[PDB]
Every structure is written in C-alpha cells, then in structure tokens.
Ligand binder design. Structure first.
Ligand SMILES: Nc1ncnc2c1ncn2[C@@H]1O[C@H](COP(=O)(O)OP(=O)(O)O)[C@@H](O)[C@H]1O
Ligand SMILES: Nc1ncnc2c1ncn2[C@@H]1O[C@H](COP(=O)(O)OP(=O)(O)O)[C@@H](O)[C@H]1O
Lengths: 97, 48, 689, 605, 120
C-alpha cells in the first residue's frame, strides 16, 4: 500500500501476482530477486493468496496465477554433472513447487 | 528471520510480547498456540 | 469613559518612589565622591557604555533610611514584582542629573557620540530661539520658560541617552540580613504565574545565535518640511510609514514624502539564547525543558554554548500561539529577558586582575609544594594513582605552544591516555576533570556519533541562515575533551581524532560544507586493552588494539594494570569504606583544594609563557639521544613501544615547559625537565610489576 | 447583577447543601486546604523575617443522596456543575471567612455509562461528562494564558483593569465579547501596561490515543484532545497511561457561520486527569498503606527470620533458588544512593545476571520480577532501536523545534529494567549499556540536542549459555560468551544448572502437580515504605567484615576463578545496605555483612 | 463495476462492490441546533432532518442587528456522527495498465463503524 504520485490519498496495489489472477504470471531471472520478493512468490504458490497487513488495511487478496519462470544456471551453460538443484542457486524447496 | 525469532521463542512460553521501542513500552498479549512445520535437512541421514 | 476600562487603586505609588530614587542616586554614602555621581560621570566622560544597578546597595540604602527615618517606601519589593517599568522610570530619573558638559567630544572619541551631541545642541538652541522670540513681543520669569518648553518639539530623552541600564538581583549575604529576587530556578520551577517578575535561573546555554542589529526606533527625514519622524518599533515586524507626519506637513495641501536613514535610528544589539534544565534538577521521569532568552545592549556576546549559568532577568511575555486553530486565546508564549549574567566555572584565560585575588592565590602558594598539593587535589574522591593525577594537573595547565614567525604552530597542549581494565576507576578521573575544567566536555563513542564531533549545517531560526553547529570537539575547545570506551568508537571517529593532533584543524569536505573549523581541544582518552584484560603472555601493542600511527601522538600513556596486593588493597578498602562512611575523604592530614580557587590558580598559571635555559636544553638533547637509542636497541618486541619518535621529545619539552609554569618560572630549571622524564618513564614500565 | 439569580440556579445550589453537608466528609476537607495554606503563609512571613483549590466529590454519594442530581450531572454537566461549584465556593467562603476563585470539583466516580473509551465516542455521549482512558501523546508545550490586564496612566495616575472570556471559560456558552487590548484610554492619555499585576493562568492541551493493549487486533488508532488548565497542567508526560474524566464539548461554529464538509471541532474540558499504572508504563506504586498495614510491617520488622520467609514469598511456582530470590529482593531495595559533595556519586542499585540451560525459568522468573517491581519496562533481545536513548527524533514535532523522545532506560528511571536473551543483543548496544550501568547516566551528542540525561535504573538480565547445554561442565570463562567488562558491571553472576536427578525429579513432580490444582499483595506495600523510609547509612560494626571478606576474595579467588576488582567491593557495600533495608534498621550491621558475604559466595561458589 | 459509472447514474440509487482502503475519523454534524441572536436576544431553532456534505443548511442572516448575528448554543444542540469511507475497486482486476480508481463515501449515524478497512 503505497502513497500516490503528486498529492493523493493512499491506494492499495497488488504485485504481479494479484493483478494477474486467473491469468498467467510471467517472471524471469529468479536468481536476481531480493528475498523480500522471494517470500512473496513462495507464499503465493503455497496458499494461492497474498495477505497484506499494512498499513491499517488488512486482507488476503487472491492470486491463483500460473507462474512461468525463466532462470539462469549458476555461471556456465551447464555448471556441473551435479544435480539441477546443485546446478542452480534457487533453493530446493522453492523448486519443488 | 532472527530478530523476530527471538520474539517468538520469548512469546510462546509467557504468551506476551514486550515492545520497548521509542515512546511506547507496551506489553501486549498473544494467547496463541503455535503449530509449526519445519523442513529437515539432507534427508534420512539427519535421522542417522 | 468610566465603568468601561475601570480604575483600580493599588498599594503601589510611583509618584513618591521616583523621588525616592532621585534621593538614592547622586546622593549616597557607602561607596569623598558618592558612587553614582562619579560612575555616572565616567559615563558622561563617555568612556563607559553600560550602567549597572544593584539591589544590594539599595538594601543598604533602606537600612540607612529606616533608622534614621523617615520611613521610606520599599523600592526593592516593588522592583522584583514589576521590574519592567522601573527600567524606563529609573532611566528618566538618571537622565536629569548628570555632569553637564562634561568634556570635549574631540574627533574620535566616537561616532554616535557626535550625533548625540549635536542632537542635544540643536535641542538647546531651539529653546533659546523660541524664548528669544517670544520675549520680544511681551506682555515670574519661570512662566515664559514653561511656555517655550511646551510649545516646542524636541528630541525626546529616550532617543538620546547613549547608555543602557541593567539590574543585578540580590542573593546572598543580604538574604540572611535578613531581607527572594534571586532564587536560582529550574525551568520546570517556573510556573507561568511569574510573568513580569525579575527572576534568576540556572541552566545550560545551548544554541545562542549570532548578534545582530535590531531597531528600537526608526528615523525618517521629510526633506521637504525638514524635521524627522521617529517611529518606535515593537515585536517582530513593522510597517514603514509614508507620506508625512510633520507638524508642518500636516494640514498642508501637499504632504511631503519621507525615507529612512539608518544612521539616525536607534539600534540595539540583539542576541537570543536558549537554556535547558541542568539535568540534575529534572524530576525522576520526564525530560529537560527548554526556555528562550533575549539579550540587548552591552550584555551581548557574554554567553556561549555548553555553559552552566545563572541568568538574572526581568521575565516578560511576547505574543504568539501555535496553528491559528490551536489557540483558545490570548495565551502569551512568553520568554526571558536578560539583565545580568553570572557564570559557574568562571572562564580563564580572560581576567584583567590579579587585584587582591592574588591573595586568594597566595594561601595556595605560601604553603609551598604547590605541584604535589594540587596534584592530590584533583579528584581526591578516588584513592591512589598520585602519578596519574600528578600529570592531569599538567594537562589542565597545558601551554606554551609556539609560533615560528613565518608562521606555523606546534601544539601547545598535552594528550593523555588511560589504559587498563576493568576496574581502577579510570573514567571517574574524567568525570572529575570535565567537572573541574571549564570548557570541558564528556563524551563516549557510541555514544558521540561522527556527526557529533563534526559540525552540521542547519538552518538557523530567527537570524539566518544555515549556521554550522558542531559538537564535542568544536563545542569543547580551548579546553579539555574527554573520551570513554575509546575502543568501540569504530573508524570514522578515529580519523577525526587522529587528525586533531595536528591541532587547529578539522576539515569537512562533505556536501554543503567546505569549511575548515578550528579545534584547539585537548584530549584525554580512557580505553580498555584487548579482551579481557591485558594478557601478559601477549606483547604490548598486541593487547593494545590501537595503531602506532595514533599512539605516537599521545605524549603520555598511563597504563593502569591491576595485580592483587594484600597490603595495599587493605588501604584501598579502608578508603572506600571510610567514604562512603564519611563524605570528606582526607584527614590527618591534608587540605583538599577547592576546585574554584584551584581554577583560579591554574588561570593565573596559564599567563606566564616560560622559556628554557641553555643547560636544560643540552640536557634535553642528550637525554633524547639516549632515549631514542635505548628505545630502538630494544629492537624486536616485548617491552617497547618504540621508537620514541620526535613527538616524545617535543612532548617532554612541552611537559617540561608545563611543570615550569606551576613554578611560574620563566627559568625552566633542570629539575623541571628531569621531572618530566620521570613522569614519562613512570607512565609505562608499570608492566614489569 | 448579570442576568439576576434564577430559582433554577437557586434550587440547584440550595439542593446541593444537604449534600455536601451529608456526606459531611467534604465540609472539613475544604477546611484542611485552608489550613495548609495558612501554615505556609505563616512560613513565608515569619521564618525568613499553595495547594490547588479543587476538592474531590464521589459520584457514589449522589445515587443514595440525590438521584435526579446524579442523573442530571452525568446527563447535563452544563447546568448542574457550575451551580455546584458556586455552592462549594460559598461554603469555602464560610469556613474561614475572616482572612483575605473557582474552587472546582473533581467528579471521581463511580462510572459509568459513560465509562467509554476514545474509540467508541460521540455523538450520543456528546455534551455529557465522560471517562476516557488511554495513552497520552503527543502532549504539548505549556503556555500562560492572559486573563486580566492592568495599565498605568500618566499624568492622571490611577490604573486600570480588564477581563477576558475565552471560548473555554466557565462551561456553558456565552455571547462572546472581544475586548481588544485596551490602550489609548479616553480621554486620550496613553497607557503603559504593567505586568505581574495582571494575572495569568497556565494552559495545556494533550491528546489521548486509545489503549494499545486494549486496542483492536490491528487498525489505525484514533485519538481525542483534551484541554487542561492551571492546577491540572503538566501532571502527565507523554507516554503515560491516563484516565481522563471531563465534559465533552462541541465548541465552535462548523462552517454554518461563514456562508460561501468538516465541522464542529470537539474536545474535552478538564477535569480529573488521573495518571495510572499499566504493565511497563508510568509509575505507579502508589501506594496506600492506611493505618493498619504500616503497623503490620512494624510488628514484622522485629522478627529475626523474616528475610527467609520473604525470600520464599516470591516463588509460589518455583523450586529452590532461594539464593536468587534473595538476590531479587536485594535488588528491589538497593543500597540507598549517595551523592558526594562536589564530587561524583557512587552507584546505589544492584544489577543481576542469570545464566543456565533452558527450562531454568530464567525467562519465567523475570515476568514475576516485572509484576511486583513498581515499574519498569521489559526489553527482550533485539529489541532496541536505541534501547535507552532519546534517539533525538527528527524532525520538528512540532513547528520545527528539535526535541527528545525518551527510550526505555530513561523512561525506566528509578525502576527495574528486564533484559531477556541478554546475549543476543548486538554489541553496538552493549557499548551503551556500559555507560548506563555503572556511570549511571546516558549521554546524547547525536546531531542535535546535546545533553547528558539521567537513567539510574536497576537491571536484570537472563542470557542463554554459549552453545547448547554445555554451561554446566564448561570452564569459568568461554562459558559466558559476552566479555568482558560487562561480566564485571553486573554485581552478581548467578549460574543455574538443569542437570537431572531422579530424587530431585520426584520432588519436582509433586509440586508441579499440586500447582495445577507473605501473600504477594502485601509484598510491594512492604517494599515502598521500606524504600523511602529509611536509609540505613553505614556503621563501623560491619566494615572490617567486608574488608576481610573482600581481601580474601581477591587473594584466594584470583587463584580459584575470576573476575575480581574494586567493583566487587562496591557491590559488597550495596548488598550490606540493602539487607539493612530489609531489616528496616536505621543502621548497617555485621550480620547483614555476613549475609552479603553469603550470597556473593554462592555467586562465586 | 466501479470502473463503469455513467453520468446518467447521478442522483439515482446505484449499487456497487469493492474493497475499502480507508475509513476516517468520525466527525459531528448537527441535526438539531438551537440558536440565539446576540443583539436581538431572540431565540430560535433549526432542525435538519436529512442531509447528504451539501452543505445542507446555514444559519440565517437576520435577527441591524446584522450581518448574521445568530449564535449557536452548544448546550441544547444535539449532534450525530459521520464517517467518510473511501472505496477502492478490488485490486485484482481489471486495470492491468493503471492505478485503480476509487470513490469517496459518506455514512451517517447507524452506518458508522459497521466496517473495518479491508472488508470486502
Ligand atoms: N582508588 C579508588 N578510590 C575510589 N574508588 C575506586 C578506586 N578504584 C576503583 N574505585 C571504584 O571503581 C569504580 C570503577 O568505575 P569506572 O571508572 O566508571 O569504571 P572503570 O573501572 O572502567 O574505570 C568506581 O566507581 C570507583 O568507585
Ligand atoms: N523451578 C521450577 N519450578 C516449576 N516449574 C519450572 C521451574 N523452572 C522452570 N519451570 C518451567 O519451565 C518453563 C519456563 O521455561 P524457562 O526456563 O523460562 O525458559 P527460558 O530458559 O527460555 O527462560 C515453565 O513452564 C515452568 O513451568
């Protein structure tokens, strides 16, 4: 929930997830994402809803989105014979989703 | 996270969170009973 | 009309009181010429700008007029309770009786003295002309004078004075005379019921913005009708008048236009300063309050930040409120006005005399062995470490610096460290010193931020703008600064302090600041060795975490290490039990030197600027080679610190030159220098115990 | 004559005679005030040769006495309060009539309908006398308010007078007359105003938020401001928890007036403004000891074994730890305070640490410390920001004046600060805690307001062992994990083990069982009188004991264990004096010294 | 849909759904206000039964004596409450390009506090 441009009352806004509900959410370069976002995506996949507690506004918005992602392997084209989870940075539990 | 992890492990026993930040020192109530599901590491060997 | 704006009588009568005043001034006894005649002449001879009134000598005036009647109405209790009106009335009382000519006005002399003169002169000639004319017509001789005086326009007295009037309230011996006007007060202690009274407060000055001209009355010049137009001016703002008020430009068809002349008008030097609660007086909870103060005329510039002061002034309101919708009305917002200033911790090095005050120095001198006596007399509250204190006396004294004539400077002062842990009460010495020394300031690392020592640029309210406000180092300079927890200060701070031993400098290049401000500060730093305490299996410089770039700057590093000793710790325990048990520590026998008179002695010490003899010079040199060579022949580790870099030499010359000053010297004898070496070797070398 | 007396008013005054005459308790109360002033009036005059005028009135009374006058005040304060005040003024003028003002009423209560919190308020409750509680913020700066004027006039001598009626004067509305500020008397003489003759009355307005503990789960808070005058001014600082009782006004015109959305600014007049206590905030002990209690103490002080009973009274739910409980008492009392002449002061209070495996109740003990503690704020780990600091809050608040907002350790002054997970706390803070604990003061140079402000608080801390359960066997050092000077600053370092035994186990079992199926009340009352009365000073009975002891400690323990310094000695004296307070003795004793010895031993061994 | 409101809906009953961003501090309006002329000393009353934010009713202009003398008496006047809710469309859909638009509400008396922000 963010203060508006110029001078205006505070409007609520969803992330890509809320905005795209029933539709298709398209994200790329997970590896470059700040954890603050990572938790949001994780939550969205987990319970199919984003909860917002700030400021006074308190809800659960519903994002049912299909996530399609583009990710970049750590370093080279094929980083190792080692398994995919080892091949890329993204932790195994987020990947299991 | 760490900072709120402290808060939890102090909360679950005495049910009350205590916040001394700035001009409000309030001690506020959590009567909640936590149900947590952790994820263990490395699999079956962690049982070994 | 009556019954609107009704009348009410009061015990107060100004009519007779004015006359009482006139009897008091210009006719007096206690202090062949009576005090106020002569003083007022020294004002009339024009060498003295301010005229300082005392309520004390007024007390004695009344006990003279009481006895020895007839009964005279009480001035003083009428004075404290109002005090605004009496300035102006007292003022006209004075204006009448003055030595009249009293002497030539020369050339300079001064400006604004001549304008005054010519105003008084034209003031006389007008009357002479009018009476000369009237008498010509006709048709005892008092009358015509009266007529002339009341038909003529003259320069009002208040516009031509040249001098200011201030009051100093009574404490003191007089309070127990017995005889209120000075009860030093907290800013909590001020109820809003005291408005108008003459009150005395004690608190810390802060802020205290730049002095600038404020205008009491404005002069315009019609240029057509001639004349002048003086408008009195009040509060914050005014509207400049136009057209003309001239009696000759009245009722005319065409009014002339006028415009101001800043040379004619009456300006006062205006300075505003805030005072905060002394922080001891604060009730257990809450927070220290703030209070505004104004300063006009002579008292200006007498006040500075980081001062603990008794300010005595007549306390008056000025109209304000918060957001317009926030007032019930009319409120006042108030402020304090400043008549007279009395500073705790009186400030050296500035005093002229050295008149009968030397007497107050002599009780200290005559007993002899001043150096050990004072030494012990710094922070007696703690036991032991006579050496440490022995040096701290020098720190307080300092000197002599030098100027190479080209020129560049060489400090100039002493820099002390106190090492060791956890106990030994190292920081109590620092609360001690920062209590004794004026312009001392106590800070800690995390604590005092990097922005705490450097000066920020912030917009200045009222007078403008964007003034550099510093803290710590700038706030305390020309005097001792004190630091605790000197390890935890991190990095950016250490660079400041690392640089300030070039003295005379900080350089702030950031953002809105290019300035290089001057910090003349002294530094004392209490620090703890690397954890936990001084591991003897580690070399020095290992258990001192500090770089060698910085320590070379410190001239004296006192490392206080604690090894338990059955004999001594008994003595200690006896001391710390004796006090608490008593408040006063020394008995049988020593006399602890009161910090006030001590500060006086040190003040009289800093004045000397001694010079070295040839012999002591050569001795310093030879001993310096031996110290260099012995420091380096140490070579690898243990022991140390090396290398005994030249700053230790200059340091010991400077310590020498300090010890001299407590002899008052100018000689700088050999035992002085030798003593400096003693203090130096004793500083360290306590790590062998 | 004004509008001349009306039998509405006439009856409303006259009927309020019998009460207060019955219940008569007030009739002499007023007298008392008079008395207190008189004596003090005799103190200024003769010796070198005050109180507020409002008297509380219980609403309890009216119900029995007058139903209609009750229901009336509550429902219509405007009409019943000012005649009541009139009556009491008349009476107060009767009590002592000879030597030569509002005399307001409190309205305690016995609330109320009309008991309501600032969240649920207006418009049915509008213009009725309300009881509204909550946090007090942001408060406000006190300003004197001008009421009467005085002027001097030359050449005719004389003087003058004027009166000023604000929107908030009286209670009921009145046809507003602006008086200007009289100057330029007619006939045309100038008027030099004079001060100190012209009276003033102080003025303050504080806004009250709804209670954060009684707050809804989450939502924005909503507050209502209150105006306070003269005697009521400045009573409460921002951050206190306060019950405000007073009228609720509609004052002002709401845009209906100027013909060309928002409307009718509303605020509460007066009236009682009670400061009160709630956990972690705002004093309040208080306490009332009456006649009987103090006697109980006095009787109980003589008994020789009391200390052990007391020390057992803390722990209904906790085994053993008699030594630690003893400690917590000895913190509650705390060695007086001693500020030398023209010199630094030696620390009075005692600080404590607890280290042991979890389940040690270390976090459980502290809450019970908190409850009976009389203050103070609790802090758990991180925690912060600033902990005790004012943080030097930027910016403004309001109009651009830089002001300080006091953190915990400042706000906790004269009290017991708790610290949980004391190890977890960032070193950055610890650096400050050094300054807080021993030195006893806080110093803020930040930007800024540059001041040394005082936090003299007592301190407890519970902190987990370094890694796992290893505390028990592990070395006297490397076990603590938080070197170094901190270890010293704390007067007592107590170690507790969770190591298990079957016997001790059984003995745990039964008490745990019974729990699920010297009274705490009298404890704190026992404590306050003990605290302000009376400080035991120090005696030559004891000193040689603590000296022997101390020297023993250094010499032998420096072989045994660590750390030991002069600090330990200081602590010895504080403990001695504290146990003296427990004994109520006007003096320190040798026995006490032996006690201090004991607990510092179990600290060490 | 909140997105779609024609200008032909003005002063007609319109029903729509959304998500409340914010509700506002209560304010007080006057349903019954007894008035007094200051000079004339005459007394009256104005009772406003229904109102929207108009502003519906202003004090009269006539009791010389004038301009409008009338003083509101606050002790005998009765007041009510007013909220100002502010409704946003569900952030879910369907802006897709833009900052979603909102309308302002006014609730009188018994419609106050019925709603916590966040409640659909
Ligand atoms: N010789 C002494 N005389 C008096 N007090 C002492 C002495 N040595 C130690 N102390 C006590 O030890 C305490 C140490 O306090 P402080 O200086 O703040 O910390 P540190 O021990 O780090 O210097 C002081 O309060 C002081 O009372
Ligand atoms: N001496 C005791 N008697 C009874 N119960 C105890 C005792 N010590 C601890 N407990 C139990 O331990 C729990 C408190 O755990 P605690 O030791 O406070 O955790 P932490 O180590 O985080 O402080 C409580 O449920 C309490 O019942």
């Amino acid at each position: 929930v963010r203060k508006d441009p110029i001078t205006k009352e505070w409007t609520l806004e969803g992330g890509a997830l809320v905005l795209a509900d029933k539709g298709v959410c398209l994200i790329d370069e997970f590896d470059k994402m700040n954890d603050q976002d990572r938790t949001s995506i994780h939550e969205a996949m987990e319970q199919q809803s984003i909860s917002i507690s700030k400021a006074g506004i308190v809800t659960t918005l519903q994002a049912r989105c299909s996530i399609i992602a583009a990710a970049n392997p750590n370093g080279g084209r094929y980083n190792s014979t080692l398994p995919l989870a080892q091949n890329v940075s993204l932790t195994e539990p987020i990947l299991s989703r | 996270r760490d900072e709120d992890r402290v808060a939890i492990h102090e909360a679950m026993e005495q049910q009350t969170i205590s916040i001394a930040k700035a001009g409000i020192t309030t001690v506020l109530n959590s009567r909640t009973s936590v149900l947590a599901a952790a994820n263990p590491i490395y699999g079956r060997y962690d049982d070994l | 009309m009556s019954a609107a704006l009704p009348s009410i009588q009061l015990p107060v009568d100004y009519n007779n009181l004015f006359n009482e005043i006139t009897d008091f001034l210009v006719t007096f006894k206690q202090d062949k010429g009576p005090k106020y005649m002569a003083m007022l002449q020294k004002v009339a001879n024009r060498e003295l700008n301010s005229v300082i009134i005392d309520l004390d000598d007024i007390l004695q005036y009344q006990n003279e007029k009481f006895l020895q009647g007839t009964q005279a109405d009480d001035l003083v209790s009428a004075i404290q309770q109002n005090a605004n009106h009496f300035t102006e009335l007292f003022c006209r009382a004075i204006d009448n009786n003055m030595p009249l000519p009293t002497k030539e006005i020369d050339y300079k002399d001064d400006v604004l003295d001549v304008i005054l003169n010519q105003r008084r002169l034209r003031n006389e000639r007008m009357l002479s002309d009018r009476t000369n004319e009237i008498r010509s017509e006709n048709l005892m001789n008092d009358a015509l004078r009266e007529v002339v005086e009341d038909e003529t326009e003259l320069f009002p007295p208040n516009l031509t004075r040249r001098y200011f009037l201030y009051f100093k309230p009574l404490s003191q011996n007089c309070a127990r005379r017995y005889r209120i006007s000075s009860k030093p007060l907290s800013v909590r202690q001020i109820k809003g019921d005291f408005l108008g009274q003459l009150i005395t407060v004690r608190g810390i000055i802060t802020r205290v913005s730049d002095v600038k001209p404020a205008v009491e009355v404005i002069a315009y010049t019609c240029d057509q009708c001639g004349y002048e137009v003086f408008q009195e001016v009040n509060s914050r703002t005014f509207t400049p008048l136009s057209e003309c008020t001239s009696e000759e430009c009245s009722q005319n068809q065409t009014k002339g236009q006028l415009f101001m002349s800043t040379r004619a008008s009456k300006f006062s030097a205006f300075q505003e300063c805030k005072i905060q609660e002394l922080s001891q007086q604060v009730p257990v909870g809450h927070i220290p309050r703030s209070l505004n103060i104004h300063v006009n005329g002579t008292l200006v510039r007498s006040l500075s930040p980081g001062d603990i002061v008794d300010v005595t002034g007549i306390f008056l309101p000025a109209p304000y409120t918060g957001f317009k919708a926030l007032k019930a009305g009319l409120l006042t917002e108030t402020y304090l006005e400043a008549q007279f200033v009395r500073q705790h911790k009186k400030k050296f090095a500035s005093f002229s005399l050295t008149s009968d005050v030397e007497e107050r120095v002599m009780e200290l001198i005559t007993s002899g062995d001043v150096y050990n006596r004072l030494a012990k007399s710094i922070a007696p509250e703690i036991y032991g470490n006579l050496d440490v204190k022995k040096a701290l006396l020098l720190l307080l004294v300092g000197g002599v610096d030098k100027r190479v004539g080209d020129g560049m400077k060489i400090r100039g002062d002493i820099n002390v460290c106190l090492m060791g842990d956890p106990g030994v009460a190292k920081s109590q010495l620092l609360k001690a010193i920062c209590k004794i020394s004026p312009r001392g300031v106590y800070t800690t690392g995390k604590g005092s931020s990097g922005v705490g020592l450097t000066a920020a640029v912030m917009k200045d309210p009222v007078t403008d703008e964007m003034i550099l406000e510093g803290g710590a180092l700038v706030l305390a300079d020309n005097g001792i600064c004190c630091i605790d927890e000197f390890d935890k200060m991190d990095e950016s701070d250490r660079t400041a302090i690392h640089e300030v031993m070039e003295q005379q400098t900080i350089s702030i290049s950031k953002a809105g600041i290019n300035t290089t401000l001057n910090a003349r500060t002294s530094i004392l730093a209490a620090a703890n060795p690397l954890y936990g305490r001084y591991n003897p299996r580690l070399s020095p410089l290992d258990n001192i975490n500090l770089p060698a770039a910085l320590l070379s700057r410190f001239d004296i590093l006192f490392l206080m290490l604690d090894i338990p000793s059955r004999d001594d710790d008994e003595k200690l325990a006896e001391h710390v039990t004796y006090v608490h048990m008593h408040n006063k520590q020394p008995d049988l026998d020593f006399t602890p030197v009161e910090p006030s008179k001590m500060r006086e002695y040190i003040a009289y010490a800093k004045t000397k600027r001694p010079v070295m003899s040839e012999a002591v010079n050569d001795y310093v040199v030879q001993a310096y080679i031996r110290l260099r060579q012995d420091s380096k022949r140490e070579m690898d580790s243990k022991f140390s610190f090396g290398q005994a870099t030249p700053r230790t030499l200059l340091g010991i010359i400077r310590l020498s030159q300090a010890l001299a000053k407590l002899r008052l010297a100018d000689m700088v004898d050999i035992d002085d220098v030798e003593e400096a070496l003693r203090l130096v070797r004793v500083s360290k070398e306590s790590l062998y115990q | 004559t004004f509008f001349a007396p009306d039998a509405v008013f006439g009856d409303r005054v006259r009927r309020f005679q019998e009460f207060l005459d019955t219940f008569t308790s007030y009739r002499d109360s007023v007298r008392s005030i008079q008395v207190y002033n008189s004596n003090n009036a005799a103190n200024y005059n003769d010796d070198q040769d005050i109180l507020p005028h409002r008297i509380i009135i219980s609403l309890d009374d009216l119900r029995e006495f007058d139903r209609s006058f009750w229901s009336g005040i509550l429902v219509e304060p405007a009409y019943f309060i000012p005649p009541a005040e009139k009556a009491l003024t008349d009476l107060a003028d009767s009590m002592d009539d000879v030597p030569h003002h509002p005399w307001k009423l409190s309205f305690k209560g016995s609330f109320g309908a009309h008991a309501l919190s600032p969240r649920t308020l207006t418009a049915q409750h509008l213009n009725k006398l309300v009881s509204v509680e909550g946090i007090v913020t942001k408060t406000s700066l006190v300003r004197p308010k001008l009421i009467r004027s005085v002027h001097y006039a030359a050449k005719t001598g004389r003087f003058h007078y004027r009166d000023y009626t604000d929107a908030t004067t009286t209670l009921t509305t009145r046809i507003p007359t602006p008086a200007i500020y009289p100057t330029e008397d007619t006939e045309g003489n100038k008027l030099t105003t004079e001060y100190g003759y012209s009276t003033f009355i102080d003025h303050q307005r504080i806004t009250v938020q709804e209670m954060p503990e009684m707050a809804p789960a989450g939502q924005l808070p909503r507050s209502i401001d209150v105006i306070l005058d003269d005697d009521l001014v400045d009573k409460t600082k921002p951050g206190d928890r306060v019950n405000v009782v007073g009228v609720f006004k509609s004052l002002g015109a709401g845009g209906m007036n100027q013909s060309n959305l928002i409307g009718f600014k509303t605020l509460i007049l007066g009236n009682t403004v009670y400061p009160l206590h709630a956990r972690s905030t705002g004093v309040a002990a208080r306490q009332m000891l009456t006649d009987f209690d103090i006697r109980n103490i006095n009787k109980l002080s003589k008994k020789k074994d009391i200390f052990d009973i007391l020390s057992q009274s803390l722990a209904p739910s906790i085994y053993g730890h008699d030594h630690i409980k003893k400690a917590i008492l000895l913190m509650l009392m705390g060695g007086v305070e001693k500020n030398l002449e023209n010199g630094s002061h030696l620390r009075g209070d005692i600080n404590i640490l607890m280290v042991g495996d979890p389940s040690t109740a270390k976090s459980q003990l502290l809450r019970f410390v908190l409850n009976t503690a009389s203050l103070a704020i609790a802090t758990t780990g991180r925690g912060s920001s600033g902990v005790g600091l004012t943080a030097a809050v930027t910016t403004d608040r309001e109009t651009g004046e830089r002001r300080l907002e006091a953190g915990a350790m400042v706000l906790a002054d004269r009290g017991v600060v708790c610290i949980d997970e004391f190890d977890k706390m960032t070193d950055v803070d610890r650096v400050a805690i050094h300054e807080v604990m021993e030195q006893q003061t806080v110093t803020i140079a930040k930007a800024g307001i540059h001041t040394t402000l005082n936090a003299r608080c007592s301190v407890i801390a519970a902190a987990n062992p370094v890694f796992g359960q290893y505390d028990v066997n592990r070395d006297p050092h490397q076990n603590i994990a938080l070197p170094d000077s901190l270890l010293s600053r704390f007067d007592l370092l107590f170690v507790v083990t969770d190591d298990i035994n079957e016997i001790r186990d059984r003995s745990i079992s039964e008490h745990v069982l019974r729990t699920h199926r010297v009274t705490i009340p009298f404890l704190r009352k026992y404590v306050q009188y003990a605290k302000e009365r009376v400080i035991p000073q120090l005696t030559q009975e004891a000193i040689n004991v603590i000296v022997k002891n101390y020297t023993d400690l250094r010499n032998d323990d420096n072989t045994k264990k660590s750390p030991i310094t002069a600090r330990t000695l200081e602590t010895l004296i504080r403990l001695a004096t504290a146990h003296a307070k427990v004994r109520l003795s006007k003096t320190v004793n040798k026995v006490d010294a032996k006690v201090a010895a004991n607990l510092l031993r179990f600290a060490l061994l | 849909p909140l997105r779609d409101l024609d200008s032909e809906h003005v002063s007609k009953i319109v029903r729509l759904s959304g998500i409340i961003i914010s509700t506002s501090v209560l304010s007080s309006r006057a349903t019954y206000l007894s008035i007094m002329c200051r000079n004339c000393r005459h007394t009256t009353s104005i009772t406003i039964n229904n109102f929207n934010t108009g502003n519906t009713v202003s004090l009269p202009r006539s009791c010389n004596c004038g301009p409008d003398p009338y003083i509101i008496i606050h002790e005998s006047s009765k007041f009510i409450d007013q909220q100002f809710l502010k409704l946003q469309e569900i952030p879910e859909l369907v802006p897709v390009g833009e900052m979603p638009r909102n309308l302002t509400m006014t609730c009188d008396r018994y419609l106050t506090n019925k709603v916590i922000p966040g409640t659909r």
